[PDB]
């Protein structure tokens, strides 16, 4: 019934991703905003697929796809808060309570994804978007994949993600469980929120700072910035053996996880 309701003005670049660009579009009638992620197939059927499965307040909403010959357009929730990456001040981090709130929302979203059998595989502050109220949303299912189907797990073997965030089993083992990889990467992001710095270049036995963590020398950065409650949680998440690593139901019971810290909005 409504005429030009389907015209959007491309208003500005939001981020020029590796595969193309995302542009803030705005509806000319309604003034609705959306990010339109632009992928030129000639330079994704899975990313569209996984996106159609998803519905949850801490996951970026996907509205639809315009096909346009070669240019793939993906029509996604606009988060005017930008990326979490930007609320982490270098060498400092952010207030404990802001962190603990963003960590509760990250867990929520991750519980939502594992429970529908999807693994995101690239969790990091650049992929954690914040709306106008400062609600966290998990973004970008470009690297993600299925790890339970018809209620049977499959082990992963493809190496992916982003080295400083990646679990150590994925560098040492041919095959590994999906869910401890995401947990692990959640703890790297926590460590960043609380110290403003990343602990190691990669979780290799050839990485001095990683050997230091494994040795427990927490009198060094970034751990000295951290504080015994959160850090105790981090001692359970960054455990090298993925079978011994804390799981999400157990992070929900953790003492700092349940510590009152913040006065509501
Ligand atoms: C400020 C700066 C960059 C931003 N990127 C978004 C954004 N929302 N939805 C997306 C979906 C995919 C990629 C980016 C986004 N909002 C921003 C606000």
Curated annotation (Swiss-Prot):
Reaction(s) the record says it catalyses: L-seryl-[protein] + ATP = O-phospho-L-seryl-[protein] + ADP + H(+); L-threonyl-[protein] + ATP = O-phospho-L-threonyl-[protein] + ADP + H(+)
Q: Where is this cross-link: Glycyl lysine isopeptide (Lys-Gly) (interchain with G-Cter in ubiquitin)?
A: 124
Superkingdom, according to UniProt? Answer: Eukaryota
Would the keyword Protein transport turn up in this protein's UniProt record? no
Instruction: List, in alphabetical order, the Gene Ontology terms for molecular function in this entry.
Output: ATP binding; histone H3T11 kinase activity; protein domain specific binding; protein kinase activity; protein serine kinase activity; protein serine/threonine kinase activity
Coiled-coil ranges per the record? Answer: none
Provide the protein's localization: Nucleus; Chromosome; Cytoplasm; Cytoplasm, Cytoskeleton, Microtubule organizing center, Centrosome
Activity regulation reads: Activated through phosphorylation predominantly by ATR but also by ATM in response to DNA damage or inhibition of DNA replication. Activation is modulated by several mediators including CLSPN, BRCA1 and FEM1B. Proteolytic cleavage at the C-terminus by SPRTN during normal DNA replication activates the protein kinase activity.
The region called Interaction with CLSPN is annotated at 1-257
- Which residue intervals define the domain Protein kinase in the entry? 8-257
**One of the GO BP terms on file:** signal transduction in response to DNA damage
Which residues does the annotation say bind ATP? 14-22, 37
Q: What is its EC number?
A: 2.7.11.1
In this protein, the active site sits at: 122 (proton acceptor)
> Which GO CC annotations does the UniProt entry carry?
centrosome; chromatin; condensed nuclear chromosome; cytoplasm; cytosol; extracellular space; intracellular membrane-bounded organelle; nucleoplasm
Family stated for the protein in its record: Belongs to the protein kinase superfamily. CAMK Ser/Thr protein kinase family. NIM1 subfamily.
Q: What does this protein do?
A: Serine/threonine-protein kinase which is required for checkpoint-mediated cell cycle arrest and activation of DNA repair in response to the presence of DNA damage or unreplicated DNA. May also negatively regulate cell cycle progression during unperturbed cell cycles. This regulation is achieved by a number of mechanisms that together help to preserve the integrity of the genome. Recognizes the substrate consensus sequence [R-X-X-S/T]. Binds to and phosphorylates CDC25A, CDC25B and CDC25C.
Q: Which disease is it linked to?
A: Oocyte/zygote/embryo maturation arrest 21: An autosomal dominant, female infertility disorder characterized by zygote development arrest due to failure of pronuclei fusion.
* Subunit and interaction comment: Interacts (phosphorylated by ATR) with RAD51. Interacts with and phosphorylates CLSPN, an adapter protein that regulates the ATR-dependent phosphorylation of CHEK1. Interacts with BRCA1. Interacts with and phosphorylates CDC25A, CDC25B and CDC25C. Interacts with FBXO6, which regulates CHEK1. Interacts with PPM1D, which regulates CHEK1 through dephosphorylation. Interacts with TIMELESS; DNA damage-dependent. Interacts with FEM1B; activates CHEK1 in response to stress. Interacts with TLK1. Interacts with XPO1 and YWHAZ. Interacts with CDK5RAP3; antagonizes CHEK1.
* Name of the protein: Serine/threonine-protein kinase Chk1
The species this protein belongs to is Homo sapiens
Source species taxonomy: Eukaryota, Metazoa, Chordata, Craniata, Vertebrata
Span within the entire protein? 2 to 273 of 476
